[PDB]
Amino acid sequence: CGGLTTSVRPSNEDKQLLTPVVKDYIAQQLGREPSEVKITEVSRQIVNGTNHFLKVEHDGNCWHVRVHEALPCYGGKVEVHSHKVASVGDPLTYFLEH
Amino acid sequence: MCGGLTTSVRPSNEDKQLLTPVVKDYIAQQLGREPSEVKITEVSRQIVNGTNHFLKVEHDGNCWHVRVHEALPCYGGKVEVHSHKVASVGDPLTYFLEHH
Amino acid sequence: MCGGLTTSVRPSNEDKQLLTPVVKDYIAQQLGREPSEVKITEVSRQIVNGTNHFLKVEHDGNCWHVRVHEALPCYGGKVEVHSHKVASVGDPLTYFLEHHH
Amino acid sequence: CGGLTTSVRPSNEDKQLLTPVVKDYIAQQLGREPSEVKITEVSRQIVNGTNHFLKVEHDGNCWHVRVHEALPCYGGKVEVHSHKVASVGDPLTYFLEH
Amino acid sequence: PMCGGLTTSVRPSNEDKQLLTPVVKDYIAQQLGREPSEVKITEVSRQIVNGTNHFLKVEHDGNCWHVRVHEALPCYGGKVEVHSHKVASVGDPLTYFLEHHHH
Amino acid sequence: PMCGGLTTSVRPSNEDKQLLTPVVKDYIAQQLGREPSEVKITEVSRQIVNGTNHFLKVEHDGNCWHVRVHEALPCYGGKVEVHSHKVASVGDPLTYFLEH
Amino acid sequence: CGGLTTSVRPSNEDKQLLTPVVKDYIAQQLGREPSEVKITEVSRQIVNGTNHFLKVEHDGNCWHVRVHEALPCYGGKVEVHSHKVASVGDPLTYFLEH
Amino acid sequence: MCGGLTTSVRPSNEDKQLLTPVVKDYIAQQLGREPSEVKITEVSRQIVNGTNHFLKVEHDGNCWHVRVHEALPCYGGKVEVHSHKVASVGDPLTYFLEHH
């Protein structure tokens, strides 16, 4: 359940994907302004599940945490996908922090 | 239409049992030591249907595997990188999740 | 793992309200006349997650559009044609569902 | 919701998976095996929903009917995908009749 | 065999009837090729089972079968039994199956 | 996640061959009505089982079957499936059975 | 499965079964018998899994190592529970070294 | 019979992939230095179902948390301490594994 397709070379896929990878991610953290980006291999996984956004207090600090839980028929994995430092009074909203 | 967040609430006991161990382990690995007190005070849920694209990417003589999530349009349509790891060109492209 | 059928039951009122109009119209078109009594006596459900592939297919100088369903492996993995229609090469490949008789 | 992807020419994987299934279907529809079968264009739609298998009595006849209901976020369409003549005593099982 | 003995046969509870009756009814229908009218469970006996199902590819005299063997752990009674088979190819993947030979 | 997935296929160990070969050989012999000449197990994949077998006496339309239903624990997928049945008389004791 | 129950005071059965085992362990760890030993709180975790007993050679030394692997539905943790220095010729048997 | 070990064998590639990193990290922490070559030469498996009892124990004015494993009767019934740590009386009793 939740398996990856056989790796292939990208086709149109390049136009959709390449830009995000080049942009802020890698451009931000990892130095700045990457030169050469080609991809070369792509593999897809269909995922249905739920994101749990959590406010967590630990030892006098406060994080927001994004935990992904895949449905059982999509592999059932539970993983943290990101966190950010927050204040107690901050609203718990959708976020992605690199 | 879909993919909105539920109103933030205090977690149930079931929520705490499922989520706390996973969060606790993540904090421990991020900080390099186990936390003493860990309390989930608020939870909000979002249904997500989409696809993860696992990519082998060569950039300026380096090779990364990158995990990019694409939500379906009716689940908000967001496209985001969720993780990367340094890899060798010969490494198989498999499922991964790499933290910091 | 998923994609099995539930045990057959007599339909609820919700089932009858959702399904009856669609079935009635289908029978009418198949037989060329509206039926008088239509009664759903048993229902069994299957969750399906997969992809529809809409295909333009050329064979011996004819062109069909073909709707092929592919269930995910954990929903049974079946690959099946669900309908076809005669088309021309210049027709756009769009969503369709074609009943023949 | 439930929209089709941009048309592309089929990949080698597409041709390997889909061509045999289509070829067999054409053969059965026409009553003879075709000589050339070529998929020239493909467009994909992700679907989640439920198949309802129904026993239906109408005007002294009995059919099994396969009705697909897409979830609202996958377009919400409700459609008959096939039927077969059945006896009242037949078990209601998975089927596809062309 | 410390564990894995059968309980004393009793009349089923309402919970038993609700869980098991639909499943049995559907199985009978598929076995006979016709839906039964009345289906009643009159007696139940229960066994705890811990063990492993082995799916096997087995080649014999130029034929290939996939075979489902259940092995209970020794302290659950230790029985090793074939439940079913299907004819397969050498090239077929060895996957989960359960074959009833319905009508 | 839930348990009761299949392990990766392997060639059988010597322990596997010793335990399983006799049982399979006998089963083939009974199915075909003659002992096979060559029997080799070439590949094996395992699934953990944790649950309960329900042995049932069932009356349906004036016939009587004994039915063996397996119920996996919730954390092993929760499936309830019939594994076998036999024709019985109404007066027969309900005991352990396996009918091919 | 595999979460910890809410902490409670130990039952009389808990005290009778577990106190001697804990007392003996403390005695061996400290090299002298304790006077007073009291269990004040207990939290329980059901675990199903497998112990892997390993003979491991590293840099000209040989250890036996006991690694516990919980089933996926019991949390999937893989942890070393003990080790002992051994010779290459020693049989690999069940052990627990404190 | 109950909770017996399998016959020792050379590890499979799956065994090496799962177990080697965990063992390597443990050795590193025990010795204070990462080993160069780590090789698993033999493996034996024991299937175990039971319960971990996490205990807060006060003994002669000191406070330990203790992890005691109890195997079910049909898995051998053994009761063993698997680890302890020094704790404060106010510490929450949570899952732990202490190597020191």
Coordinates of C-alpha atoms in Angstrom, one line a residue, chain F residues 12-92:
Chain F
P12 CA 13.1 -21.0 1.7
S13 CA 15.5 -21.9 4.5
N14 CA 16.3 -25.5 5.5
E15 CA 14.0 -25.2 8.4
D16 CA 11.2 -24.0 6.1
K17 CA 11.8 -26.9 3.7
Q18 CA 11.7 -29.4 6.6
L19 CA 8.5 -28.1 8.1
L20 CA 6.5 -27.3 5.0
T21 CA 7.6 -29.8 2.3
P22 CA 5.8 -32.9 3.9
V23 CA 2.6 -31.0 4.4
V24 CA 2.6 -29.7 0.8
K25 CA 3.5 -33.0 -0.6
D26 CA 0.7 -34.8 1.2
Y27 CA -1.8 -32.1 0.1
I28 CA -0.8 -32.3 -3.6
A29 CA -1.1 -36.1 -3.4
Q30 CA -4.6 -35.9 -2.1
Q31 CA -5.6 -33.2 -4.6
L32 CA -4.3 -35.1 -7.6
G33 CA -5.0 -38.7 -6.4
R34 CA -1.3 -39.7 -6.8
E35 CA 2.0 -38.9 -5.1
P36 CA 4.0 -36.2 -7.1
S37 CA 7.5 -37.1 -8.2
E38 CA 9.3 -33.8 -7.8
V39 CA 8.2 -31.2 -5.2
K40 CA 10.3 -28.1 -4.6
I41 CA 9.4 -25.0 -2.6
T42 CA 11.1 -22.2 -4.6
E43 CA 9.9 -19.0 -2.9
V44 CA 8.2 -18.1 0.4
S45 CA 6.5 -15.0 1.9
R46 CA 5.1 -14.9 5.4
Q47 CA 2.2 -13.1 7.1
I48 CA 1.9 -12.8 10.9
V49 CA -1.5 -14.0 12.3
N50 CA -3.0 -12.8 15.5
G51 CA -6.7 -13.3 16.0
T52 CA -9.4 -15.8 16.7
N53 CA -11.0 -18.7 14.8
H54 CA -14.7 -18.9 15.3
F55 CA -16.1 -22.4 14.6
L56 CA -19.9 -22.1 13.9
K57 CA -22.8 -24.4 13.4
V58 CA -25.0 -22.8 10.8
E59 CA -28.5 -23.9 9.7
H60 CA -29.6 -22.5 6.3
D61 CA -32.8 -23.6 4.5
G62 CA -32.9 -27.0 6.1
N63 CA -29.1 -27.8 5.7
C64 CA -26.4 -27.7 8.3
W65 CA -22.8 -26.6 7.8
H66 CA -19.9 -26.2 10.2
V67 CA -18.0 -23.0 9.2
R68 CA -14.5 -21.8 10.2
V69 CA -14.3 -18.0 10.3
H70 CA -11.0 -16.2 11.1
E71 CA -11.2 -12.8 12.8
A72 CA -7.9 -10.8 12.9
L73 CA -7.3 -8.5 15.8
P74 CA -7.9 -4.7 15.1
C75 CA -4.1 -4.0 15.0
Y76 CA -3.7 -6.8 12.4
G77 CA -6.3 -5.4 10.0
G78 CA -9.6 -6.5 11.7
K79 CA -10.7 -8.7 8.7
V80 CA -13.3 -11.4 9.2
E81 CA -13.2 -14.2 6.6
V82 CA -14.4 -17.7 6.1
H83 CA -11.6 -20.2 5.8
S84 CA -13.6 -23.4 5.3
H85 CA -16.9 -25.3 5.8
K86 CA -18.1 -28.8 5.9
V87 CA -21.5 -30.4 5.6
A88 CA -22.6 -31.7 9.0
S89 CA -25.5 -33.3 10.7
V90 CA -27.5 -31.2 13.2
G91 CA -26.5 -33.6 16.0
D92 CA -22.7 -33.5 15.2

